[PDB]
């Protein structure tokens, strides 16, 4: 307890000696309280809103712009703990077969910050920051920590740049070298991209099995146990030398014994705990892959009880893993806490003992109620999307991503942060428009609104900011290259599920969902407000061009049949 975290608490105490006190009436019960000290934007994107007038009266769009971490998860039973250890050891070996753990560099970290002190850009350029990094790194090498403290604000657990670099240096390889790519992990989807997720679910559906299960865990990061953190730590067994010690330091000193600061009505509390995850992707994917294989084992009756595992059962588990483990991994699509599983049959639905005992209690369902599966891959939820099968005029088949259209419009109408110029606002509007042209072209209102935004924003202005922080986004729309060329590269040329590589010559060859399907997924097609908007779109485009000024514009509307 106090030995590993003491040095971090001491520094905070000395830094705030004047204010430092032990508040006897604090609201902590699961977190260890140490002391407290005294202490001290969802903006609308006007370009997008002006070009999406019918949605000004749609509440689901307009409303978008307008301490549940102090819980304890019971220690799993001895059998669950054996199941997790056997599975985690097996899974790290499968993952390491074709990959080599390595340290990530200052140059790679600098390359990241230079894309995505008052800024990380400022600190990374200053030699003194790297000297502070050196002092922290040398403490880690002898099993000590002084500055790796989380700053809470779901709750986002921030960290100082140097603590982030040390974490990235030791464990960045998991993401940088694609350990959870579908090729390497079989269940993983890291590096795939939203436009491949649909084809992966259709491939999973081709397997013989029961329904497709896609159970959400209620607050996954709070359900990460010490047992999970210890099982994830086993990746150090595949490392050597300096790398091995640095990674063991991140796990033991910053993950298994964290020091967190949080503002309370204004005091700053200094709390600690051995479990939970600060809200990485790779480690959540690993542990979810492990938890879902164990559920598959239970469904298949590999073991009878979680309370304890029989001498023979432990062998049966190891035999199951060597015999069918990889095939069972391939029945899954897992991205952190997001999962889709197509098990051997429907016994999985009621295989809930190990799942609940691991702490991965399902959301919006009673603890012992059997899961309700999906009978069609096109109905399955995955990473806030569902997927449609679209047949092109030429017979080729696209598998496209989709979500309720109000969510898409509501999000594009939001600008995050302060001090944006009209040019930066217009350029973020352009990033959303090009993202829609690439991913959601099949939605009538979005292809129209996207062409309107691209017609209203100066043609050579470069898309800015980001439309999403999703790890599934590859940002192909962040360019001034013609979007028909980008569409052909993404959907035809580089698409492995597309055998015929004939390019598309116009947007008119690119299909939409059926009109009724489009309305079902939130289209305003058929409404009077929408017909007026579509008919008078040049007027809305001109209003924005007039606000931006005397610039060079292109009319993208005639790429559509009606225009
Ligand atoms: C996570 O929680 C959030 C909460 C609020 C806001 C937001 S957000 O606006 O920042 N993002 C999303 O809502 C969102 C976006 C995507 C993608 C879009 C385009 C992609 C591609 C490609 C090809 O290169 S990927 C995605 O894809 C699965 C998943 C997403 O959400 C789960 C996120
Ligand atoms: Zn540290
Ligand atoms: Zn849809």
Residue numbers in the entry: 273 to 312, 318 to 343, 357 to 406, 419 to 455, 472 to 583, 588 to 601, 606 to 889
From the article:
Soaking of compound 27 in crystals of DENV2 (NGC strain) RdRp domain also generated the same binding mode, with the OH- moiety of the propargyl arm forming similar hydrogen bonds with residues K800 (backbone N) and E802 (carboxylic acid side chain), as H800 and Q802 in the DENV3 RdRp-29 co-crystal structure. Residues 800 (H) and 802 (Q) are conserved across DENV-1, -3 and -4 but not in DENV2. In the laboratory adapted DENV2 strain, NGC, these residues are respectively, K and E, whilst in the DENV2 clinical isolate, MY097-10340, they are T and E. Crystal structure of DENV2-NGC RdRp bound with 27 showed that the OH- moiety of the propargyl alcohol arm, made similar hydrogen bonds with residues K800 (backbone N) and E802 (carboxylic acid side chain), as H800 and Q802 in the DENV3 RdRp-27 co-crystal structure. Residue T800 in DENV2, MY097-10340, would also be expected to form the same interaction as H800 or K800. Two individual 29-resistant replicon clones harbored the same single nucleotide change in NS5 (GAA→GAC), resulting in E802D mutation (note that residue 802 is E in DENV2-NGC and Q in DENV3 used for structure determination). E802D mutation results in the shortening of the amino acid side-chain by one methyl group and is likely to disrupt this H-bond formation.
DENV NS5 is a large protein of 900 amino acids composed of two domains with key enzymatic activities for viral RNA replication in the host cell and constitutes a prime target for the design of anti-viral inhibitors. A guanylyltransferase activity was also proposed for the N-terminal domain of NS5. Its C-terminal RdRp domain (residues 267–900) synthesizes the viral genomic RNA. DENV RdRp possesses a right hand-like architecture conserved across different polymerase families, with three subdomains termed ‘‘fingers”, ‘‘palm” and ‘‘thumb”. We performed a fragment-based screening by X-ray crystallography targeting the DENV NS5 polymerase and identified an allosteric binding pocket at the base of the thumb subdomain close to the enzyme active site.
